[PDB]
PDB file of C-alpha atoms and ligand atoms in Angstrom:
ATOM      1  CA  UNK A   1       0.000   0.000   0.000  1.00  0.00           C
ATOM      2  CA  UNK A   2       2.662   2.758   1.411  1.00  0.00           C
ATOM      3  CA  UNK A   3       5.166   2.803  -0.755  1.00  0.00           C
ATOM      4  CA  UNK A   4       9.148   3.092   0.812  1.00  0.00           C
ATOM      5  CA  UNK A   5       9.249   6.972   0.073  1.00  0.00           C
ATOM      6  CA  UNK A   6       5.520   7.341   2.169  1.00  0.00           C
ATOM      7  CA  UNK A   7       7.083   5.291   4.430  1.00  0.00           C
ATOM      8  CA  UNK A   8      10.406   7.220   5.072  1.00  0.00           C
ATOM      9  CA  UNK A   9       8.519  10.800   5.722  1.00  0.00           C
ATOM     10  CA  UNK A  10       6.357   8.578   8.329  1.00  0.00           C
ATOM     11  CA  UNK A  11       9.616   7.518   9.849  1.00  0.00           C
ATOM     12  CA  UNK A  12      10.347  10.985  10.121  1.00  0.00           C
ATOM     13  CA  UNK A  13       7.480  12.365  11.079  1.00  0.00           C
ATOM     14  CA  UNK A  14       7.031   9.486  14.010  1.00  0.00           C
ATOM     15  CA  UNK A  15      10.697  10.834  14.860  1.00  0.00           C
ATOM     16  CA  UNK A  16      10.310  14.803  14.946  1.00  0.00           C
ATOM     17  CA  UNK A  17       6.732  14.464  16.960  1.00  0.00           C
ATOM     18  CA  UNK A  18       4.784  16.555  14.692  1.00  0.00           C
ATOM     19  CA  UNK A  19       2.510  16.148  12.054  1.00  0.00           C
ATOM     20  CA  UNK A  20       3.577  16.530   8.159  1.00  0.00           C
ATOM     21  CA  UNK A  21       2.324  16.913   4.940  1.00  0.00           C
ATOM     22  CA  UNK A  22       4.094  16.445   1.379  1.00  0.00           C
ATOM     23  CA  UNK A  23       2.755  16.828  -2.170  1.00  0.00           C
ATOM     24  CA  UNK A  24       4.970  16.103  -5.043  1.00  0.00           C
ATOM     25  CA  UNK A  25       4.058  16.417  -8.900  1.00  0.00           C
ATOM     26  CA  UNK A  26       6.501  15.566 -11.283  1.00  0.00           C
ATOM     27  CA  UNK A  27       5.620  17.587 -14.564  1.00  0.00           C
ATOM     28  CA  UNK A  28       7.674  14.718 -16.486  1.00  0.00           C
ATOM     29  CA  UNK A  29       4.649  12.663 -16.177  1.00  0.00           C
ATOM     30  CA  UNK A  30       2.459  14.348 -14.167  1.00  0.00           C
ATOM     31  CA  UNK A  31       2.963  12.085 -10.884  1.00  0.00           C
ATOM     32  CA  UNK A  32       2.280  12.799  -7.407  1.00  0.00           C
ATOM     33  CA  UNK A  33       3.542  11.356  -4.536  1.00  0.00           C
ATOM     34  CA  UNK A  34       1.179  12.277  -1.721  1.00  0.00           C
ATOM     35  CA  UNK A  35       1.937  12.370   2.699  1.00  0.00           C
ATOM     36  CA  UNK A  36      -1.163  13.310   4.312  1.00  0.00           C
ATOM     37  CA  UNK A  37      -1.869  15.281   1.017  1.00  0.00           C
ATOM     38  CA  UNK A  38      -5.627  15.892   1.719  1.00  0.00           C
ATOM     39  CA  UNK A  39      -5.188  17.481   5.531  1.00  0.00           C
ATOM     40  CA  UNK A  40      -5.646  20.620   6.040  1.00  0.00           C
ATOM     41  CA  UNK A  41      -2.514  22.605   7.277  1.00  0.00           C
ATOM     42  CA  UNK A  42      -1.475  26.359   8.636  1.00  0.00           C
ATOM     43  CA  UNK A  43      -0.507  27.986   5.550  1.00  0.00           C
ATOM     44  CA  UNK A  44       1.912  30.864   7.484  1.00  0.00           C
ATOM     45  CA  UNK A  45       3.690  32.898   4.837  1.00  0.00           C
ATOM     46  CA  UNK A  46       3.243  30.798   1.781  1.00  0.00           C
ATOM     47  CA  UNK A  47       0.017  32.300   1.539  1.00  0.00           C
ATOM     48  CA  UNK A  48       2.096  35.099   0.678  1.00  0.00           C
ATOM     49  CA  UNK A  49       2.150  33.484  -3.358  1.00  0.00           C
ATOM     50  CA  UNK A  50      -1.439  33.398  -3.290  1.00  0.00           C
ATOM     51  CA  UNK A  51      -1.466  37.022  -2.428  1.00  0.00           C
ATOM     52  CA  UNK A  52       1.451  37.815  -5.102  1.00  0.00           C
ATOM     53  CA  UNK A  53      -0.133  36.208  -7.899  1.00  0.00           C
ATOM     54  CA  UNK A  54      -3.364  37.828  -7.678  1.00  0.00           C
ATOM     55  CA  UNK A  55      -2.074  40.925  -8.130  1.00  0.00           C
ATOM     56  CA  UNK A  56      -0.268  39.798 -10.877  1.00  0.00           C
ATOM     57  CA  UNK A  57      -3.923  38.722 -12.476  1.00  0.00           C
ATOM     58  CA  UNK A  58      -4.977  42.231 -11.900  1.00  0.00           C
ATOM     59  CA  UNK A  59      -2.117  43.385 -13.474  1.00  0.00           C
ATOM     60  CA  UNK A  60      -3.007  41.145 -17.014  1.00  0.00           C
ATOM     61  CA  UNK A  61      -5.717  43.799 -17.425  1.00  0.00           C
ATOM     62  CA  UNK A  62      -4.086  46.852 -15.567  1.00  0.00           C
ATOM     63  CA  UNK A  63      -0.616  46.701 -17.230  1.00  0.00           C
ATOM     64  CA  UNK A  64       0.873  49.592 -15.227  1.00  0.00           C
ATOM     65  CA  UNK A  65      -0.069  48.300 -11.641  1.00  0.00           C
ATOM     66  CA  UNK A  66       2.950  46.693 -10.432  1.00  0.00           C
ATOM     67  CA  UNK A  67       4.709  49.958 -10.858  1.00  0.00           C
ATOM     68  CA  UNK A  68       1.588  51.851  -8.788  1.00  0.00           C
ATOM     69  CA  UNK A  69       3.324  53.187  -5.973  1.00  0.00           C
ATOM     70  CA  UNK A  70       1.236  52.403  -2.303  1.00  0.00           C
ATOM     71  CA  UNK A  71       1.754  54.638   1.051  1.00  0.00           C
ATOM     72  CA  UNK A  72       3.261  53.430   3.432  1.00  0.00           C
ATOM     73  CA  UNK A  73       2.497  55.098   7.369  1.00  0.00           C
ATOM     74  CA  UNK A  74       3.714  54.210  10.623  1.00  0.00           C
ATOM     75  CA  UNK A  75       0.564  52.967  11.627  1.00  0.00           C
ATOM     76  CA  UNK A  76       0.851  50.116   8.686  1.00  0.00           C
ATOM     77  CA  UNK A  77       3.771  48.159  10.242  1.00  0.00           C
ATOM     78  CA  UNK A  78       2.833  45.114  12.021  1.00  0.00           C
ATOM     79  CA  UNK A  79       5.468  42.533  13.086  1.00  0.00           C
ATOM     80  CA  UNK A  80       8.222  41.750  10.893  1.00  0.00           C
ATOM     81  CA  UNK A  81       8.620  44.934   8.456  1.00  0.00           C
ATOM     82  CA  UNK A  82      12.147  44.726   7.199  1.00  0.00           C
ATOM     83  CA  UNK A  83      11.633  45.944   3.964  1.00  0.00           C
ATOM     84  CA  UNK A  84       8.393  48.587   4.594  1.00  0.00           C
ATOM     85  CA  UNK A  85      10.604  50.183   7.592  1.00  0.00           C
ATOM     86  CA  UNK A  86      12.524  51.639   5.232  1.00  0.00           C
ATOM     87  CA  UNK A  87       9.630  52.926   3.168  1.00  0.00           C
ATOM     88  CA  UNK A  88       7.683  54.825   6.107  1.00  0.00           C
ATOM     89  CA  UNK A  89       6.423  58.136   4.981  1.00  0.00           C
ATOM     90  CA  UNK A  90       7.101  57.129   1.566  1.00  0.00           C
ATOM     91  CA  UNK A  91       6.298  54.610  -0.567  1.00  0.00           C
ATOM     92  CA  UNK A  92       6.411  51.025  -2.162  1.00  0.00           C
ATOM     93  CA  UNK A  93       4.705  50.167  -5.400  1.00  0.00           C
ATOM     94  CA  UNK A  94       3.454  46.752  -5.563  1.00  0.00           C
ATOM     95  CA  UNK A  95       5.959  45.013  -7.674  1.00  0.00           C
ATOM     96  CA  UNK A  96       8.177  46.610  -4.756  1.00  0.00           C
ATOM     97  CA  UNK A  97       5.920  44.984  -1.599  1.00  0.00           C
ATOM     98  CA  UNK A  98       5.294  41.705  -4.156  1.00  0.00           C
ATOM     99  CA  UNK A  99       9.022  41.300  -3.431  1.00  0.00           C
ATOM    100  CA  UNK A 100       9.192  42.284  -0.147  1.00  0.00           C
ATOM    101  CA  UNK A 101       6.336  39.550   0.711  1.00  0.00           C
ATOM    102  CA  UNK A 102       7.855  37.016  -1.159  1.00  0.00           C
ATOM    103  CA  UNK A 103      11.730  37.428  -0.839  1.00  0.00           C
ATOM    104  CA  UNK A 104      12.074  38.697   2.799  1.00  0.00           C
ATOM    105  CA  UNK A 105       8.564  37.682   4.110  1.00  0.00           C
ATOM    106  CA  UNK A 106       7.919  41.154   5.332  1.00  0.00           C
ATOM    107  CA  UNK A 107       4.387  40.898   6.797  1.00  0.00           C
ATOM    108  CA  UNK A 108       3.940  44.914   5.983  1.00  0.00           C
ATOM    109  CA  UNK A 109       4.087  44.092   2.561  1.00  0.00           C
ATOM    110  CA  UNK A 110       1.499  40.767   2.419  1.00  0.00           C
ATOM    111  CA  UNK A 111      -1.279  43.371   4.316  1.00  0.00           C
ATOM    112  CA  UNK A 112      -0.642  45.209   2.103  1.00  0.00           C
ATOM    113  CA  UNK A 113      -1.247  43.287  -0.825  1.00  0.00           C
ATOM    114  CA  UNK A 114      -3.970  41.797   1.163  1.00  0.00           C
ATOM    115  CA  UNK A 115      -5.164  45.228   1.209  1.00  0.00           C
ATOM    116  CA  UNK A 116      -5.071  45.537  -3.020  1.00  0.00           C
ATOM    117  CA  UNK A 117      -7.243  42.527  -3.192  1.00  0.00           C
ATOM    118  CA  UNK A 118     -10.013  44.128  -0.907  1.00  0.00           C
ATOM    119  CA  UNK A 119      -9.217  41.874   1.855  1.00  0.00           C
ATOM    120  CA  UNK A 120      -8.128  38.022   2.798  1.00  0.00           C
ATOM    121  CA  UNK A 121     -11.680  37.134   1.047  1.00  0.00           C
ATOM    122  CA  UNK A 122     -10.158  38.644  -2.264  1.00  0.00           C
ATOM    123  CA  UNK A 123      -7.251  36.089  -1.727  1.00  0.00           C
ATOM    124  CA  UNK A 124      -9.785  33.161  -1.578  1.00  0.00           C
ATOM    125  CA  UNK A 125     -11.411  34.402  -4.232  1.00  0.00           C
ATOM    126  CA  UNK A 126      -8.726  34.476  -6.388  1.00  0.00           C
ATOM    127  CA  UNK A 127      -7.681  31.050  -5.356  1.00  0.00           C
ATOM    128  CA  UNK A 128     -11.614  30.086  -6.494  1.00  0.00           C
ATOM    129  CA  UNK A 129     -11.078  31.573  -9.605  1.00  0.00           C
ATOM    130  CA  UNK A 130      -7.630  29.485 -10.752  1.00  0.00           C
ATOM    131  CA  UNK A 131      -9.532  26.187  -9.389  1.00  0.00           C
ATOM    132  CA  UNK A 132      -7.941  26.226  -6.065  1.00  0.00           C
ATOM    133  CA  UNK A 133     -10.904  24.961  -4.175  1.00  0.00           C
ATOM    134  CA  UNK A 134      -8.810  24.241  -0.919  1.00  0.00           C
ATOM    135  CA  UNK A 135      -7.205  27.715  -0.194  1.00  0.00           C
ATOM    136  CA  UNK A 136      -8.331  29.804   2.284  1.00  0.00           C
ATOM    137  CA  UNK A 137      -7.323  32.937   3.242  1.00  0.00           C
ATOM    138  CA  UNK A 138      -9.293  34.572   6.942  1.00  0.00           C
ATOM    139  CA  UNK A 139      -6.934  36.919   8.537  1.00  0.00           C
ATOM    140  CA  UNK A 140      -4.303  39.672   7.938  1.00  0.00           C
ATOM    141  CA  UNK A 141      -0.939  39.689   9.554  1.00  0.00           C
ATOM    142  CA  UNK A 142      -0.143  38.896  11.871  1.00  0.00           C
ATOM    143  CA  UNK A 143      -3.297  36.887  12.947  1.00  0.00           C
ATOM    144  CA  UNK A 144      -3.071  34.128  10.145  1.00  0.00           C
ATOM    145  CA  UNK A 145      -0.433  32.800  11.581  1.00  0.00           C
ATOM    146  CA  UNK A 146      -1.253  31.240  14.937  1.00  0.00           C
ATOM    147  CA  UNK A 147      -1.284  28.145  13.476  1.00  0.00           C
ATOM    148  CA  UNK A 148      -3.989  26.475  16.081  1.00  0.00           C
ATOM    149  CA  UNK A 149      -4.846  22.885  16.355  1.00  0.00           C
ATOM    150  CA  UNK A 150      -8.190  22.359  14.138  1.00  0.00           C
ATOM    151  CA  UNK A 151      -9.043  25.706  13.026  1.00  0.00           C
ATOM    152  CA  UNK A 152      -9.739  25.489   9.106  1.00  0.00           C
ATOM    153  CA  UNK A 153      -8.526  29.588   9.278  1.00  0.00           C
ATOM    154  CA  UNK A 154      -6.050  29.999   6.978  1.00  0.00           C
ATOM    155  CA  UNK A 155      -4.909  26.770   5.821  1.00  0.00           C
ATOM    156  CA  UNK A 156      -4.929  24.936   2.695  1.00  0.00           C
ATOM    157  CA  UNK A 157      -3.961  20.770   1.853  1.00  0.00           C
ATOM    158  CA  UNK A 158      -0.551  20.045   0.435  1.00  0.00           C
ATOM    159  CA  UNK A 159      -1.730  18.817  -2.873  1.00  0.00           C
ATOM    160  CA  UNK A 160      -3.905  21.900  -3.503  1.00  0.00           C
ATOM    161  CA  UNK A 161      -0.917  24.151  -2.416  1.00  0.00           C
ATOM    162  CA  UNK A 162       1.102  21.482  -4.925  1.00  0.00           C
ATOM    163  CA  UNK A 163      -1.464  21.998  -7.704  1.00  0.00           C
ATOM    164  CA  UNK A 164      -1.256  25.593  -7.431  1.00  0.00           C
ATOM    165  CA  UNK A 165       1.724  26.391  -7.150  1.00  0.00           C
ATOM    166  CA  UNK A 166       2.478  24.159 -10.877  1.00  0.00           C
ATOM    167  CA  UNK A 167      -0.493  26.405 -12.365  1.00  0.00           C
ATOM    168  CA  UNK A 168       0.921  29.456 -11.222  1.00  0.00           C
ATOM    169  CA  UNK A 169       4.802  29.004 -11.651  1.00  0.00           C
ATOM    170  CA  UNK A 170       4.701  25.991 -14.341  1.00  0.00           C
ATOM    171  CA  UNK A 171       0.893  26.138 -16.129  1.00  0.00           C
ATOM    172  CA  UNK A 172      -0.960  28.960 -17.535  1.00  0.00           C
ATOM    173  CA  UNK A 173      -3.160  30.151 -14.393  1.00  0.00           C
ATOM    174  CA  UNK A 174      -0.881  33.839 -14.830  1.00  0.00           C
ATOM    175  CA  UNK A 175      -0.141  35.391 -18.432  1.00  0.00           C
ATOM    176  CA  UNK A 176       3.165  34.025 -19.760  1.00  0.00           C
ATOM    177  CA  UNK A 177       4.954  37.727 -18.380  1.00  0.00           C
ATOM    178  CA  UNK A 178       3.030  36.939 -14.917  1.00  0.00           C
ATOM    179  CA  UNK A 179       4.402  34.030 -15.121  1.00  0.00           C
ATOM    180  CA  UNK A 180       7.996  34.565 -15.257  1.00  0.00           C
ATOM    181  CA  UNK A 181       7.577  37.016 -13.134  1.00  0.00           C
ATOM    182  CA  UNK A 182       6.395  34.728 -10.110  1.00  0.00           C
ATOM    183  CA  UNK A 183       9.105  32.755 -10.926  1.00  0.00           C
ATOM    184  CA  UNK A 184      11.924  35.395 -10.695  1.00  0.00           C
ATOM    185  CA  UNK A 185      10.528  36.282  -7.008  1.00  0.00           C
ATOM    186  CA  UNK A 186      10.656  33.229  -5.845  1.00  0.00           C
ATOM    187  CA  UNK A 187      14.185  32.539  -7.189  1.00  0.00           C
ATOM    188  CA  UNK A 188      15.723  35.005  -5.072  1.00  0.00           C
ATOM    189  CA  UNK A 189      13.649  34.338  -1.862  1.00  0.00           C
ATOM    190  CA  UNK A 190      16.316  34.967   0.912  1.00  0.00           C
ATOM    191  CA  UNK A 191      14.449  32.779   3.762  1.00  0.00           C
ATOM    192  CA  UNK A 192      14.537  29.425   2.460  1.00  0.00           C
ATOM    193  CA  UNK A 193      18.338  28.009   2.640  1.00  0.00           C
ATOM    194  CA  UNK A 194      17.517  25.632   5.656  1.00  0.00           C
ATOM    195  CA  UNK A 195      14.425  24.576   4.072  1.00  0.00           C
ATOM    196  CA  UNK A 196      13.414  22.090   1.236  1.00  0.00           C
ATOM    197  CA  UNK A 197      16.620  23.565  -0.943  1.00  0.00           C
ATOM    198  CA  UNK A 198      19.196  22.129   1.993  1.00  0.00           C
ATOM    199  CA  UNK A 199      17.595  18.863   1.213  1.00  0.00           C
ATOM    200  CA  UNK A 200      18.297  19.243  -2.669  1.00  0.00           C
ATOM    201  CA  UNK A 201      21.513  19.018  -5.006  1.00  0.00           C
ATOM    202  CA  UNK A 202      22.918  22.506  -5.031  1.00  0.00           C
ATOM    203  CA  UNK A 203      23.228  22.083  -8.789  1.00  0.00           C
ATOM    204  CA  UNK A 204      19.633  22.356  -9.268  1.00  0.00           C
ATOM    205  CA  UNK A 205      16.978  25.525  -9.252  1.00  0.00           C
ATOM    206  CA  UNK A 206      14.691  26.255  -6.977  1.00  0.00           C
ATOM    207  CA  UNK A 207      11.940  28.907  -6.274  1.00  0.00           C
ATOM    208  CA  UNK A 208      10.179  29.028  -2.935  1.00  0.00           C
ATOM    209  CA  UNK A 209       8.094  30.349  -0.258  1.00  0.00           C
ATOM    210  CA  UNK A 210       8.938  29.940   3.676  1.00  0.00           C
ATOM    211  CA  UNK A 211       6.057  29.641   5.916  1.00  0.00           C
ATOM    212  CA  UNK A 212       6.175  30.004  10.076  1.00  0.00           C
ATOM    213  CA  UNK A 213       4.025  30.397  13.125  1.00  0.00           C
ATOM    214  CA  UNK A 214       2.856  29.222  16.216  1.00  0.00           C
ATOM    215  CA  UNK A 215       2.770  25.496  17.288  1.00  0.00           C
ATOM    216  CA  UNK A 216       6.290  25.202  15.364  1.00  0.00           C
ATOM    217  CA  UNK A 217       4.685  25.601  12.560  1.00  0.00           C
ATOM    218  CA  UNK A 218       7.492  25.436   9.484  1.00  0.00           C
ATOM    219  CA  UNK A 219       6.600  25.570   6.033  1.00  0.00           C
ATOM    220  CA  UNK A 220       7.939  25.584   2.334  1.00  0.00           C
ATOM    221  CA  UNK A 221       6.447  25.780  -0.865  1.00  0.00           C
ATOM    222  CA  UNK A 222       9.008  25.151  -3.840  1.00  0.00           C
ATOM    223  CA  UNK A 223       9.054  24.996  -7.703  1.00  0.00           C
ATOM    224  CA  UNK A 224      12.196  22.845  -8.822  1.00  0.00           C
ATOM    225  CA  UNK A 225      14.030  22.913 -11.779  1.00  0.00           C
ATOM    226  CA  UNK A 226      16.407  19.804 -11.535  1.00  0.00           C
ATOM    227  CA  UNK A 227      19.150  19.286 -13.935  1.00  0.00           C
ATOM    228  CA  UNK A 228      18.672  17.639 -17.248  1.00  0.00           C
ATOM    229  CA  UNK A 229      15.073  16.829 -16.388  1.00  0.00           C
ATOM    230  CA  UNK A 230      11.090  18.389 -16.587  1.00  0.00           C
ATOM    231  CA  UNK A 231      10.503  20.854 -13.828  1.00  0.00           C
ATOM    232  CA  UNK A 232       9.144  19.699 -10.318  1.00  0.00           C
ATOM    233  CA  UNK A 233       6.452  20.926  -7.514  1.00  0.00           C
ATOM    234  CA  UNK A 234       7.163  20.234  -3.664  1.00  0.00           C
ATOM    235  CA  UNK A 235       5.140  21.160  -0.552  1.00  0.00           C
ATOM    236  CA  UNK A 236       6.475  20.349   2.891  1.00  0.00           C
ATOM    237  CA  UNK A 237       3.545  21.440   5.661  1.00  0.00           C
ATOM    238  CA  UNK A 238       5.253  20.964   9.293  1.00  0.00           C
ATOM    239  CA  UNK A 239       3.163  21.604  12.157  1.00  0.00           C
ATOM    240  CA  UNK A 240       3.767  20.458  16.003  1.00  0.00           C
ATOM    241  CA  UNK A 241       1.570  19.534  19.225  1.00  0.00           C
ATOM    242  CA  UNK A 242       2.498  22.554  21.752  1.00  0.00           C
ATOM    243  CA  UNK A 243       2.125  26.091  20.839  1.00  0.00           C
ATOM    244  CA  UNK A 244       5.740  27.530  21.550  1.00  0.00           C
ATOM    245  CA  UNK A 245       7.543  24.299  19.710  1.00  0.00           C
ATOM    246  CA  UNK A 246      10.555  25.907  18.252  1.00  0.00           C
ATOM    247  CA  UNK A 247      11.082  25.614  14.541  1.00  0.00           C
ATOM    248  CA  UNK A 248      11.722  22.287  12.612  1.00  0.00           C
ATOM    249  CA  UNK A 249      13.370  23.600   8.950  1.00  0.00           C
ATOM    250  CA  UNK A 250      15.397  20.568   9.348  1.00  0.00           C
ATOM    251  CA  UNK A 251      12.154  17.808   8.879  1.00  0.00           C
ATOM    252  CA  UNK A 252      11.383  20.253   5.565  1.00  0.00           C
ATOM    253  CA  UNK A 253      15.306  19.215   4.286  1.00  0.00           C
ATOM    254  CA  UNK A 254      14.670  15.676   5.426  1.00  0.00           C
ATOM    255  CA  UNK A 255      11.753  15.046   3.299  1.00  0.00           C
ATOM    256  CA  UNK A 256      12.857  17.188   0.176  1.00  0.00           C
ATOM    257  CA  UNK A 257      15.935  14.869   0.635  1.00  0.00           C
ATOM    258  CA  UNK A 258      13.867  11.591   1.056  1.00  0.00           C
ATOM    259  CA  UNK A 259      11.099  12.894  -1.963  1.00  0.00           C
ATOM    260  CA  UNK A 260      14.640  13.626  -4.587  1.00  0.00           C
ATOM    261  CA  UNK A 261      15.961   9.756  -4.546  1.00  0.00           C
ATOM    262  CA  UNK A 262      12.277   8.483  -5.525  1.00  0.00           C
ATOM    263  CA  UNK A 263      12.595  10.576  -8.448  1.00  0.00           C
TER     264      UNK A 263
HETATM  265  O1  LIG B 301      -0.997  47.868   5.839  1.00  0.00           O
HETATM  266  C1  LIG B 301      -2.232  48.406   6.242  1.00  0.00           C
HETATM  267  C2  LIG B 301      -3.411  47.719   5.577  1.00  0.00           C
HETATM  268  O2  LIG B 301      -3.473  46.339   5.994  1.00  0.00           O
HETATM  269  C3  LIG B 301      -4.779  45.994   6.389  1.00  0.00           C
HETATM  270  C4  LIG B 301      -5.055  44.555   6.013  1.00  0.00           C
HETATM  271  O3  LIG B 301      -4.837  44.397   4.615  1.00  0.00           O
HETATM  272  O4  LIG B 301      -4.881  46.170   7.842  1.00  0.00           O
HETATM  273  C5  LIG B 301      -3.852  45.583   8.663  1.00  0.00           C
HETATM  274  O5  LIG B 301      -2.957  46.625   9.178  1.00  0.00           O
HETATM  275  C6  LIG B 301      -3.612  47.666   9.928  1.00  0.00           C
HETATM  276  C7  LIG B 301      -2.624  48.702  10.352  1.00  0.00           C
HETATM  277  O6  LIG B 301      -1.390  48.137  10.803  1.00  0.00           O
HETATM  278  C8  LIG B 301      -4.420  47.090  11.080  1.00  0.00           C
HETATM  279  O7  LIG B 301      -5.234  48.165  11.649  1.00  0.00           O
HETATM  280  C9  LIG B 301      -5.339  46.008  10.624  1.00  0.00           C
HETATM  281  O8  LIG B 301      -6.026  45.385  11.697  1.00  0.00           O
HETATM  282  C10 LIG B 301      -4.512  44.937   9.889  1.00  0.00           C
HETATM  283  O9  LIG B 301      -5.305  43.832   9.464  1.00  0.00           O
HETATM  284  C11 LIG B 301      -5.676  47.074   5.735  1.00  0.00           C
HETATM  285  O10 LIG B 301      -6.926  47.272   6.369  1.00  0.00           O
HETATM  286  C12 LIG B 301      -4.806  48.312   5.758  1.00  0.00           C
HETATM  287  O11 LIG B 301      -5.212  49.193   4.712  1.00  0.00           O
END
């Protein structure tokens, strides 16, 4: 029934004494190797993407609104700002807090964008309209993450996340110059070099979105671009018993690194 790679992120999930969740699709075929794949899990910051790419959608009609330049106040800053600090009494436009969100995980930035969209429900709706049925998007930052034992706020399953994330970064969901643009901001996130890319071969490229909150909760999203082969999706959901379990990046590597020899 299992098969050794289902059984291997079991091992490792009996081991780190949390709860995980993996979706792989292989775009070669179009295979997807599935760990608790239909639970429900604490999105954290990878809802950031969801955020990012609708505004990207907008912009397919709107062809000037990345460069539309958004205040930026004191009273906006919220937890983790390090990009929008730098911006206060000025401005960022939202190709500017796109990056922020995505690259730095500034939480400034994803309200935000959260903000552009008319509010988390814009998010969802979004999500609705690309066939994400899963997705759901209740709270700004930084309420969304708190991560709690069975509340459906603000999570999402690992094979919609993995099925979304191909549509956005791989498919046609975003316009071909969305697209690529996705991809270029997730390319140069800065949070993610303990994460699902210390589990792959350096040689290969990788796009992704960090996720953390409370209950340990430790997160990465990830488009993959091995060498001399089609293009992969991996989600690695991470989530713990106790509310102030420290972080677990190191289960995320482990599976990425368990997931890459069944390839
Ligand atoms: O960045 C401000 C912007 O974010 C939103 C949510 O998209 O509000 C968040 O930030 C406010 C100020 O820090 C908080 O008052 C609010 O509770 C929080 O959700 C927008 O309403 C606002 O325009």
């Amino acid at each position: 029934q299992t098969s050794a790679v289902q059984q291997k992120l079991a091992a490792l999930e009996k081991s780190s004494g949390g709860r995980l969740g993996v979706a792989l699709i292989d775009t070669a075929d179009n295979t997807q190797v599935l760990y608790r794949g239909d639970e429900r899990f604490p999105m954290c910051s990878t809802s950031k993407v969801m955020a990012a790419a609708a505004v990207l959608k907008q912009s397919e009609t709107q062809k000037q609104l990345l460069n539309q330049p958004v205040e930026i106040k004191h009273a906006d800053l919220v937890n983790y700002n390090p990009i929008a600090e730098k911006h206060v009494n000025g401005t960022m436009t939202l190709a500017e807090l796109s990056a922020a969100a995505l690259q730095y995980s500034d939480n400034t930035a994803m309200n935000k964008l959260i903000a552009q969209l008319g509010g988390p429900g814009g998010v969802t709706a979004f999500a609705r309209a690309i066939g994400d049925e899963t997705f759901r998007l209740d709270r700004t930052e930084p309420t969304l993450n708190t991560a709690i034992p069975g509340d459906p706020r603000d999570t999402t399953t690992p094979r919609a996340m993995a099925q979304t994330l191909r549509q956005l970064t791989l498919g046609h969901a975003l316009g071909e110059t969305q697209r690529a643009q996705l991809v270029t901001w997730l390319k140069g996130n800065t949070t993610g070099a303990a994460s699902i890319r210390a589990g792959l071969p350096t040689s290969w490229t990788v796009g992704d979105k960090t996720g953390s909150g409370g209950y340990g909760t430790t997160n990465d999203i990830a488009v993959i671009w091995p060498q001399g082969r089609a293009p992969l999706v991996l989600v690695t959901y991470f989530t713990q018993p106790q509310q102030n379990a420290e972080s677990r990046r190191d289960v995320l590597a482990s599976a990425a690194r368990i997931i890459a020899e069944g390839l």
